[PDB]
Amino acid sequence: VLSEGEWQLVLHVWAKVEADVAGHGQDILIRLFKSHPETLEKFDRFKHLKTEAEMKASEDLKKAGVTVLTALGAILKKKGHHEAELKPLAQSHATKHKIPIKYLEFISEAIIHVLHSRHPGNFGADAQGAMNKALELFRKDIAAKYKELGYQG
Numbered sequence: 001v002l003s004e005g006e007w008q009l010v011l012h013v014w015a016k017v018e019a020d021v022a023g024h025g026q027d028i029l030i031r032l033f034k035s036h037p038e039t040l041e042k043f044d045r046f047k048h049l050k051t052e053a054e055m056k057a058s059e060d061l062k063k064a065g066v067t068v069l070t071a072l073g074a075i076l077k078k079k080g081h082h083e084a085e086l087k088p089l090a091q092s093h094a095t096k097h098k099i100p101i102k103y104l105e106f107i108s109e110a111i112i113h114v115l116h117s118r119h120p121g122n123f124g125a126d127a128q129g130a131m132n133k134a135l136e137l138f139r140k141d142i143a144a145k146y147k148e149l150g151y152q153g
């Protein structure tokens with residue numbers, strides 16, 4: 001369970017993301033797909049993209065980035081009270097997309113990498129620790145829902 005002070009470090013860096021969610025989403029998805037190319041195979045719409053240049057030019061990838069960060073933003077703003085937000089996400093990601101918890105770990109690593117690069121003003125050691133705690137809480141609660149839904153993850 002996070003402290004309020006931990007949540008405030010999460011939400012202070014998220015406010016900087018929100019200056020340009022589309023730009024942050026492009027950097028995070030590109031870092032994910034470069035670090036773990038197997039994750040790109042889950043995306044029928046743009047799994048054909050071969051290069052970072054193609055990824056940066058993809059309007060569909062930019063929309064995916066906005067969607068992921070907006071949904072995660074809504075979850076973080078609940079400060080752990082995210083049961084309602086996680087239900088539909090768990091069901092789609094378990095049953096339709098088939099996203100293992102390992103891949104949620106990979107995108108968490110991508111988010112931390114991009115925030116550390118972009119936001120040294122709001123992403124010092126304490127803030128990164130708070131964000132890791134919030135993302136570990138998210139993955140713990142998703143993993144519990146995957147199990148309820150019948151997915152090994």
Ligand code: HEM
Nearest residue numbers: 039042043045067068071072088089092097099103104107
């Ligand atoms: C912070 C983690 C994540 C959040 C908040 C998130 C949220 C979403 C949302 C809101 C959607 C659209 C509605 C839906 O289908 O449920 C979506 C779609 C999807 N997500 Fe995620 N997601 C996350 C992580 C992942 C990861 C790591 C992958 C794959 C490696 C993944 C694969 C997909 C796919 C394949 C779609 C459908 C995209 C399409 O049809 O073009 N998601 N996700």
